[PDB]
Design a protein around this ligand. Structure first.
Ligand SMILES: CCCCCCCCO[C@@H]1O[C@H](CO)[C@@H](O)[C@H](O)[C@H]1O
Ligand SMILES: CCCCCCCCO[C@@H]1O[C@H](CO)[C@@H](O)[C@H](O)[C@H]1O
Ligand SMILES: CCCCCCCCO[C@@H]1O[C@H](CO)[C@@H](O)[C@H](O)[C@H]1O
Ligand SMILES: CCCCCCCCO[C@@H]1O[C@H](CO)[C@@H](O)[C@H](O)[C@H]1O
Ligand SMILES: CCCCCCCCO[C@@H]1O[C@H](CO)[C@@H](O)[C@H](O)[C@H]1O
Lengths: 244, 244, 246, 244
């Protein structure tokens, strides 16, 4: 088992790729669709040109990136790339408490780096037109519902993480592909309701870049901390109850 | 194995996710596409912006969710999340008769919960504009053809379920992924003909929420009971005849 | 459980039926739902009109996931050839009995006609008059010369995968169905708007029958979907062996 | 191992299929979308009809082709079909130096063949309208950023190649599928920034056909040599540091 110093840097490089490519697709969708007829308020540009196919596109950007990361770095850090996962796994005694805060920091640092680097790669348009793919409720969606859809979202994620990754009886090698594809699915449905974050670090990244680029959104941050965690811890604890 | 009480609650939580995310994509497609030019009668808003890609998006929302459920819960309840499967497996003596009615109830309860919760998450728009993703025949499609396409649909599903899940010679671990992706495929073709239900619990959920939200559609329910069961039992029995 | 030929025949019918019901069935539904939308040039015939190339990947995936489903359920029984070019290619390497090539191809053709006809019944005449029963034929500005070459280059990559992940002893077990299907899905996405990406005489036949039954005669183009696929498959099979041996 | 003569001809036939089908999708997208409303400068026709779904479509054309090639030919040549990979693997002492130049030549020859054959298959339209799918920066993207996005791109690729192919502990059989799907993912995000080449041979092919068809673009070639290599070598070396 690799030194914590190396699992930290593994968690950085992982969450960096999560936030570079995942929310990077959301930006590029918005940027190439910018100008097209948005036929109602609920449609904010994503879906304008490719309908829900735009959301699957985006979900798959996320999924296949997430999968890549697990398959390359999972053996090293565990490939958490998400604080809700770390917190959920800790709440079952599958992760050391001493390492939860160090992991989450590694995730946040990685997320900020991915968001900032994407911004540099594309130009200011990435934020002013793409929002750096930051998550926030959609037209006609309150905070109440926003956390609930984020909890129901991250509940299904963690449930798969238990079933195909943590459980001794899980078929080896499927983990990365399954976990990622699952996220990809969740984004397709949940995307146009809350931006399907499922992940505090993945929300943080853009929020920083945006508020660095003049666009302050931290009002909505709790939705992406409370929602994901209550979903993940719920999933983790339910799993164990059902499987013993 | 796990107590029936726990396989029940496993079947609820499974069918819940099946109906939350699967038909939830259908709703969100319709909602974001609401207002766009529907260039003929046959196009009812799905396909309006993203063409058949909208249907594949939707199918994948389903497929990846279904897969997630099998990989997480299949080890517990069997992950039937569908009464036609349960009835088909019983008709081969692979499932105890004592448990078919308890399973189907668990499925229906889970389906109503997933439909209701999605509704709460989004708002009334989810029903009045999205129809809660309920299945029903498409423009120029009679009841005769609607049960036949639903049979031909659920026939291919069950056939895979025999071939990659029930059969002792099936390559282990591929189950969840293959079965889900297969559904995904069916929806892509059959979607704009009957809404590709393949599943009485998956049709029931929306139908309840809709008729709770003022939109009564139970006229069409037999198409999604008869069609799927005749398809599933036909597949199960054909499989065994061919494989011995 | 090496099942009787009678049962591998009926397995090959039920397999090629699902291949032609769902595969070309997506192509029809694409056309039908997109019917009326602005086709911004000649090369766009309605597929791509609403969902761009995403419409072609949608269609390719309808094919791929159906093909995959078949292999994983019936492969253990008939071999899940569901394609005469495959049977002929495998025979040309002595991996399939000559006595069973003609019986296999007939099973495939019967299954393909049944899938095409059943889809037609399911939807209505619109399925043919508007959807063309998803029959393959060259696209605007594509000659017969190029149409067979793109169909050979197409089915060459298919058969090459079939060798590598299904026929070869050293292939990782269980991946076969998924990989072979997804591969087809890939080929359709690129080749689709050039020839309809048939890769398969039985898959072309099905629609052609239904169409010519519904008044739309297209057999002029059938050789493109017999010659092209076979020359591609037999080439792939024979190249594979040359590369992988002694 | 098979003789080098046969691994050469294996690398030709592989990179041929990479460039025929991969960039072949890009051409067909452009050709069928030719004429449609491009609602801003950043949208050059890809995305016009199917939004980002057009980019995922293209990425999957690539991914599934790449996967096919590894699964069929990887056993023979290693299925590099990419000079940056060969050069990266050499830099770790996993590939013989004597074979790096021969491999790269095989790749280039195979790429030129695939590009030329596609051109022949379709007609001049393939170049004059499709650009033979050649990669080049997008509107508002400088050379500085173009190499950085291509490095960040090919960095993720090689990182997966280490994790699921080179590493002794990698789950067997997942290689082809995972590596290809990963590329597919990268193209979806990076596509509309640089054309997501990740690969000198894959850029070369089109560039030749194009400059044969009157369209000279070699001004941009360094972006697709420097970018990919620096990304691949960085990834390879980082991996080993993290995994020992
Ligand atoms: C205990 C409830 C905490 C809320 C978790 C958020 C995800 C909601 O998920 C729900 O969890 C419930 C558990 O009570 C189950 O009864 C429901 O079927 C399930 O859909
Ligand atoms: C008929 C009088 C009873 C109230 C309606 C059903 C119970 C409340 O339920 C709510 O009703 C709203 C409609 O106003 C919906 O938007 C909500 O999503 C639904 O959950
Ligand atoms: C018999 C079970 C009652 C559960 C309390 C739900 C209260 C929602 O209220 C009512 O429910 C009734 C039954 O669905 C119907 O009259 C209407 O759908 C609804 O207005
Ligand atoms: C240092 C001198 C060693 C000479 C052996 C070189 C032959 C390489 O061998 C090839 O390598 C590929 C990837 O590298 C493998 O995947 C292939 O199976 C194999 O054909
Ligand atoms: C240090 C001596 C140089 C060895 C040359 C490479 C030999 C090929 O080694 C090969 O590596 C591949 C991964 O790329 C795998 O596909 C093969 O299973 C493995 O045998």
């Amino acid at each position: 088992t690799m030194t914590l110093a190396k699992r930290f840097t593994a968690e950085v490089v992982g969450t960096f790729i999560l936030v570079f490519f995942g929310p990077g697709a959301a930006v590029i969708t918005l940027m190439i669709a910018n100008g097209a007829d948005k036929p109602n308020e609920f449609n904010i540009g994503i879906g304008a040109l490719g309908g829900l196919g735009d959301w699957f596109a985006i979900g798959m950007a996320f999924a296949l990136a997430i999968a890549a990361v697990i398959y390359s770095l999972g053996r090293i850090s565990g490939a958490h790339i998400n604080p809700a996962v770390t917190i959920a796994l800790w709440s079952i005694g599958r992760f050391p408490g001493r390492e939860v805060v160090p992991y989450i920091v590694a995730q946040f640092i990685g997320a900020a780096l991915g968001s900032l680097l994407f911004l540099a790669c594309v130009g200011p348009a990435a934020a002013t037109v793409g929002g750096l793919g930051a998550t926030a409720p959609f037209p006609g969606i309150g905070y109440g519902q926003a956390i609930l859809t984020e909890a129901i979202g991250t509940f299904l994620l963690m449930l798969v993480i238990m079933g195909v990754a943590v459980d001794e009886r899980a078929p080896p090698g499927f983990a990365g592909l399954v976990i990622g594809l699952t996220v990809g699915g969740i984004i397709t449905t949940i995307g146009n309701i809350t931006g399907s974050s499922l992940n505090p670090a993945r929300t943080f990244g853009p929020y920083l870049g945006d508020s660095l680029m003049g666009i302050n959104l931290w009002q909505y941050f709790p939705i992406y901390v409370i929602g994901p965690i209550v979903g993940a811890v719920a999933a983790a604890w339910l799993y164990n109850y059902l499987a013993k």
